[model samples]
Target: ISDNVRIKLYMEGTVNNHHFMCEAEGEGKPYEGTQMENIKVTKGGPLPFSFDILTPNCSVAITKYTSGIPDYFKQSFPEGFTWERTTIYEDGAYLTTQQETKLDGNCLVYNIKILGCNFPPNGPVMQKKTQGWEPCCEMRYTRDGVLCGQTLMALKCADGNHLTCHLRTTYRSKKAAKALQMPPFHFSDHRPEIVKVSENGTLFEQHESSVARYCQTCPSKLGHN
Candidate 1:
């Protein structure tokens, strides 16, 4: 017999741009802490589903799967055949929720949002630092699960002035990177730390080679950011 099992994990920022959003998916039996929570065998196919909200995680107060799709989904797809809903829970409070809705032709979709994505032991936590100037100008875009976009930037009324921008990009698909006009840049693996530059130099240069610092007040006594 052939057994099909897989798992996926994702981490992102909340819609409020405050906390973290963690999403975990599980399939088949227990593999790398991904345990099969539940499954439903139907005429269409065996729909196995499970998720782990690790830590900063939660326990969704749901015992069994619902019979069919949600009312809204049903109304949207009158010809649909099956559906299921899953509620998420933190150690104390209510967290994010997810639901699996299927249409007539084996169309399955999982829906979730950051507003409901909460944390365990309490709620989600904020970023590590405060509102500081982050050099994230050069950006790469991901469209329909594919990375496709040209890096660009816009500067205001500052003529004959050299503007420096920091960039961070991830490649979800190798094909996309090869196809793009400019592939993702690479640096020494030995020195992977993001280079923090101070904007206190001439128009040609942005860093003061004499005394090193990341920000105006972030005076580095020793070699540090």
Candidate 2:
């Protein structure tokens, strides 16, 4: 066994800023710790999805896919599909969510992986007109060094700040879980490809063609306004 030395973690608050922390010693032994003391401090703020998800040291998430077409591009013709509703798997090894989305509607219910895809019971649902994904669980590091952001789908914002997004995932249907199949809530396309990777940027950049075309004449992070 190694030395069982006690390690302490602390934080000084910003003036008039409300800071909080939650700690979990173990199951049934979880509680939140709090303190109020203003002090000039240098610290690491959580990433957009926490530093882990935004910058997965090992592999990046799926940024682009053939999402230029409508919902049913194939059924009608050949050119269809797009980088619609997608998210990271539970383990964060891949953008692989099993939530299958329809080419016509919004609600997605499938798990997409690098190889293939499957319909999951508790797949994600895209909230109408919502921008950005809602944080669900902890953003932790996967075995592959990828950060796991459990939000369901990225929402698209209309106000021009964020490209509205909404990520959601539910419990695996009892039947699917018992079938020994992969969890019903995993979906993904592939590892990311940087058509043009900005210094620090979004994973959905390649799926976009150009700035003007991307924001639909809206303001991007550049604050072109």
Candidate 3:
């Protein structure tokens, strides 16, 4: 398989600078800014999880990331597409989604997402339904097993890099929070903020419950901007 190199984001406290370090595959670098998006994956024996990686149908970044997957998976696509898709089922060695994106001189291979790896079926996301339907990234059990029971999957990356996982399980009350112990797994980091969905169809992330609407960077900013 090919190795994708990338620089992850690190926070000084709870703020970002909008700039990141340039790291190469097998190497490390520093960067400022969120992970654009929380990588989601299904935990279960090489099973592909259901999630969407939306590259702005219109943007230069889209044009930029429109390269081939790692050389290993490259054979998977003779004729490639800019925006790619795949799955991650936990068979054993961590069930999650992965990718190798070409960035500058290095390649970035990210956990992108680790599906309800430790959480079993009917874990947090299933029990906490905010609305009729919602997209989320909390631990899941696309199969049969336990969740956070094993260990809260954190960055698991190299130094100078940081990964933030955004979970979108829309549940309606404190009861839901009780069921999952509400995120922020281990350290003060890996925090899980409640994303607000307005009647106007706009989304928001609150601090412990409020929103941070300025200078925030994510996949939305890169494409939805």
Candidate 4:
């Protein structure tokens, strides 16, 4: 029993503004010409949702956020990856988003994706698929159980920092690219080579449902401009 209401985007980072503007766009009204440093989901819509980063001559790097719940699940290298979920809640917690990094040639493409959590409630929580406060932060069971029954897994993040991820760009000074490319995930698979396919490729969030293209050169004005 879960609600269909989608949670907003959430993630954090420091931006290097080399005369650039940034924004995150998705299913509903989006961040218009806004820098997504220390990102978080806001009022509007539900999940099965996704977004793309923006700006030219600019970039962002992932960091472990210190607040209600650190977004990234810090883990080891991918070859022989060791993984675990840092549960901050008593009943359960969700991996609301994932920082997906794909290294190809001299560029490291960083995409923050919606990886909504599945939490089984202590009681018979109800499930609704419509969008808004009435709906739940929904997810199909990764385990074998009642997806739409007494096991109402639908609930919102008490902190309200839902739908978040961290990312980088394919274009930038090589000096910066070197720094961005070396993203480390506690769960090795979150960071992978761009060439080969992984299980993450199957998730709805991983698809390129949309894209934002901009000028190759920085604007004369300093802008999200």
Candidate 5:
């Protein structure tokens, strides 16, 4: 075994300038320790950091996170804007399922369901016609039994040498709105990528980037700028 292991973490693009304090815990033998790091994300920049593990050949997982945006911002936003705060175990090797319901002005705005994790590389991607559940990374959003949006995720962890996650999303809405609200749209796409680096003395390193054109559709009067 190596004498020590190193871990790194960073981000790309704007993640709403959130501050994340996360704990990385050893999974089992060859890895047995817990450490925490604070990541303060900035616009289109890297908040580089590194830590050491005593045991080599040990696998680590992100156990928990104490993270959120600054006090100046509220958790809620206008329509078409989405933000998420998440941490994963073994870089999403063993998954946890997540379900949430969102409300806006006392109306049930969104229902989100994300598949439980046990993700494998080359797993089938989610499709609009997909029925029943499968061992894959899937996220769906619905409103009043109507599909509003969804995102499909896949991983590429080849020979344990590197890790990458690909995400594709589509959103469509045809609701009529007042002057200040966003106009109806037929289609929207969101794609994001997550990559990591691991090496001797570096148990884990993670970076993520995303692109979504529709998020820009919100008018300046709505305070998105």
Candidate 6:
């Protein structure tokens, strides 16, 4: 089994009058500490930025398989390798609630609720229903008590094995915008790709391609003018 996992991320968005684009790539193992990678800003601001993924312990356990059986089954199996429906309680603050596992067709389906703050005890509530073999989970984050961002992480069996992650951040100005401050913007030309393997030995790729634009001028009259 290959231990190395390739990571690729592309984030582009506009904040106020600054339009920015960042691209990064790196390689690391899943369920490990943060993998720091340098981000290259190709468009606007040259601010220093780093991208990292905080993978929880249960993230690996929920997706691990052994001999055609998920590791989650080891908690309880009775009478000639037959297993009953069971739930596993993770230690510490990694999970907000116990994860329940059930057999769906030939695959095991896991229903889990994770803490919204990446690895921790608190934040908003995040939940996922994932297959035991190929697990995909998403968590949303709020800034100043308002929904502002989301992160998605997944593990797939490609060539050997691959782990991919994506993050999207958004903000809206409170005040009205001037026409001159508005940058030329358009809707995404193509739907965002779920998975991509790069020619430069990248086994996993993520792109945040959508853009949100606000009207430059406000309507003065309430009714049609």
Q: Top lDDT: which candidate number?
A: 6
Model 4 ranges off by over 4 Å: 1-44, 47-88, 102-109, 113-225
lDDT of 3 by residue, 78-98 (tens): 221122222221222123222
The global Cα lDDT (0 to 1) of model 4 is 0.22
Candidate 2 residue lDDT tens string, 64-132: 112231111122111112222243343222332232222212111112222112312232211222233
Backbone-clash count (model 4): 18
> How well is each residue in 11-37 modelled by candidate 4, as lDDT tens digits?
332211112112232221111111222
Task: Write down the lDDT of every candidate, Cα atoms only.
Answer: 0.24, 0.22, 0.21, 0.22, 0.25, 0.28
Kindly report which residue stretches of model 5 are placed more than 4 angstroms away from their true locations once superposed.
1-96, 99-148, 157-195, 198-203, 214-225
TM-score for each model: 0.21, 0.17, 0.22, 0.20, 0.26, 0.24
Lowest summed lDDT over 10 consecutive residues: which window, candidate 6? 78-87
Task: Tell how far residue 85 is off in model 2, in angstroms.
Answer: 15
Which candidate gets the maximum TM-score versus the true structure?
Answer: 5
- Residue by residue across 147-199, what tens digits does model 6's lDDT show? 23333444333234433434343322222222112222211111122244333
Mind giving the per-residue lDDT tens digits that candidate 5 earns over 176-225?
A: 22212232222222222212334332333322211212334456776542
Model 3 spans > 4 angstroms off:
1-30, 33-94, 104-122, 129-189, 192-194, 198-225
- Per-candidate alpha-carbon RMSD to the true structure: 23.7, 22.0, 20.8, 19.7, 17.8, 23.6
